[PDB]
């Protein structure tokens, strides 16, 4: 590309943000390489967890900063200036030198973080100081670069602490910092599948702890161990990643091929529940409780594709599986992803308006129907409407899949989605020259990642014109008081914002370096515990949605 002052000014927004984070996100009380998770944009101070007793702790949670690591390494790629990547190394090396448990687990995640001012460990949730991830997708290749031994031990410790049962693959969410490390964790032999295909859509009963928003990080980690580490150190890891990934595929709906959210249901192990609102899985499968009376055998938890279950399948885990297919040059991973996306959208997508219907994996829709009773999926009277996400999240996997396997039905779905997002016309196939909307005013980071994929696909410079105009609007709307904010009324900025990565990926593409930047994988973080007066609280709301 012929580069312009406007392109440079977007890189300078990102450089300003980085400078702000590295300054304002450092404690004045005790200065170390650690970073704050978030910055108050009025005071310029790092954000705080407030405990019920009123004590405050400044938050440093390395699980919520992986996207900032990716922006630092991206900035060194696009600028050819090594100082950004070197500062990412400095932060990372200090964290890994100091804040790993004896068993190899990091002190980070949903229920653990480091006090930025005192360097003490913090447990936002009383009596639950545990290791918790949930579609976090850490920046493994860079962590491996900084400290390969600690990164190998981490992945082995993550599997060892969260896999409760090596035959059912029940996965606990709350990993113990007292669990013993086992260097030979992946040397266990691969067991048979529990999935009996002639019984689907009914699935095997175990503890039912096989949700894809637990399985996906485990699969990702095992495959990155295989990819990154020597043979001997990584023995067994790709096989165990493959087994776990395959269990989801084996449990797909036997008539529609639609993907599922999990591959086992919870046994009814205790009785009685206190009421319909008591949704502990020990009372049995929650979908069968809430929907079973009207819907029958389809009503089991893995077959529910609404209430954001579809997002974890067709967005988060789809991006991971596509990334692994491409990394490993693995056509079987690829065809299975493509088949899953196609079979989901044939049942759920409405091409007249671009919406996604709330469905079960056999195609039964509950669109518009008030829930008949309370339960895990909502109170009685809740209504699920067909949804069209605010931004092009669901588009990105369809474009990445197309770039790997040119299926014309993926192309038709992407053209229809972009049409309803206001992009204009991609045209009838990937050889068309598109007619794109250069005044599109609702833009997001997903606009830029998607436009870049379509440029890599089609080589049509129109997509770069479109992305440049969108990126200028993105900076104009979200770069506010020196940080990136989803709404200019918000008080507190998270340093895990993805606008910087999206902006730098576009800059890389203008400089012919796209392949060199960390790919966006949809990982994100949160902290959950008791916040001031509120028992069941997330930083997402208690901090990052506060208004100035």
């Amino acid at each position: 590309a012929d580069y312009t002052e406007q392109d440079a000014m977007r890189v300078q927004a990102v450089k300003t943000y980085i400078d702000n984070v590295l300054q304002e996100g450092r404690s004045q009380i005790k200065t170390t390489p650690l970073l704050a998770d978030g910055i108050n944009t009025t005071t310029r101070k790092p954000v705080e967890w407030i405990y019920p007793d009123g004590r405050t702790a400044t938050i440093s949670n390395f699980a919520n900063q992986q996207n900032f690591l990716r922006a630092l390494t991206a900035m060194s790629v696009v600028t050819e200036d090594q100082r950004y990547q070197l500062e990412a190394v400095r932060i990372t090396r200090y964290f890994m030198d100091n804040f790993i448990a004896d068993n190899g687990l990091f002190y980070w995640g949903g229920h653990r973080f480091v006090n930025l001012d005192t360097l003490e460990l913090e447990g936002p949730q009383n009596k639950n100081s545990v290791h918790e991830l949930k579609n976090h997708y850490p920046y493994y290749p860079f962590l491996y670069h900084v400290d390969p031994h600690a990164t190998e031990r981490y992945i082995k410790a993550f599997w060892q602490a969260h896999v409760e049962d090596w035959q059912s693959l029940d996965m606990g969410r709350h990993g113990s910092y007292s669990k013993n490390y086992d260097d030979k964790v992946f040397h266990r032999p691969i067991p048979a599948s529990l999935v009996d295909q002639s019984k689907l859509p009914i699935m095997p009963e175990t503890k039912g702890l096989t949700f894809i928003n637990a399985g996906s990080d485990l699969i990702y980690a095992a495959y990155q161990l295989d990819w990154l580490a020597p043979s001997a150190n990584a023995q067994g890891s790709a096989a165990w990643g493959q087994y776990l990934m395959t269990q989801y595929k084996l449990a797909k709906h036997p008539k529609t091929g639609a993907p599922v959210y999990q591959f086992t249901s919870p046994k009814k192990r205790e009785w009685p529940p206190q009421s319909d609102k008591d949704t502990n899985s020990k009372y049995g499968d929650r979908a069968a409780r809430q929907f079973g009376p009207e819907l029958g055998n389809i009503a089991r938890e893995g077959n529910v594709l609404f209430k954001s279950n579809d997002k974890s399948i067709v967005f988060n885990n789809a991006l991971i599986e596509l990334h692994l297919a491409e990394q490993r040059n693995d056509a079987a991973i690829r065809e299975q992803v493509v088949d899953a996306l196609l079979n989901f959208y044939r049942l759920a997508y409405n091409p007249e308006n671009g919406t996604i219907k709330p469905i079960f994996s056999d195609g039964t829709s509950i669109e518009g129907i008030p829930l008949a009773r309370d339960g895990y999926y909502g109170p009685k009277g809740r209504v699920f409407n067909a949804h069209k996400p605010k931004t092009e999240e669901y588009l990105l996997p369809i474009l990445r899949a197309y770039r790997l396997q040119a299926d014309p039905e993926l192309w038709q779905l992407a053209a229809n989605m972009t049409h309803h997002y206001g992009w204009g016309s991609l045209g009838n196939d990937a050889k068309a020259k598109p007619t794109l909307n250069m005044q599109l005013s609702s833009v997001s980071p997903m606009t830029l990642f998607s436009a870049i994929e379509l440029y890599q696909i089609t080589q049509q410079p129109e997509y770069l014109e479109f992305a440049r105009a969108a990126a200028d609007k993105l900076v104009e709307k979200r770069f506010v008081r020196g940080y990136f904010l989803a709404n200019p009324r918000y008080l507190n900025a998270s340093i895990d914002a993805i606008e910087p990565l999206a902006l730098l990926t576009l800059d890389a593409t203008l400089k012919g370096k796209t392949a060199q930047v960390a790919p966006y994988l949809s990982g994100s973080g949160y902290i959950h515990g008791e916040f001031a007066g509120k028992e069941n609280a997330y930083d997402t709301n208690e901090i990052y949605k506060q208004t100035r």
Binding site: Q125, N126, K127, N128, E132, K134, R173, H174, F211, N213, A214, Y261, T279, N280, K307, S308, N309, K311, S312, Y376, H387, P389, K390, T391, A486, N487, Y526, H528, E530, E535, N536, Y538, T540, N541, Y544, K545
Partner: peptide
């Protein structure tokens, strides 16, 4: 634990939620 909670999809209250 000791305050029991789920980890369902859609539970963490992102700004993207309707």
């Amino acid at each position: 634990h000791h305050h029991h909670h789920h980890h369902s999809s859609g539970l963490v209250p992102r700004g993207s939620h309707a």
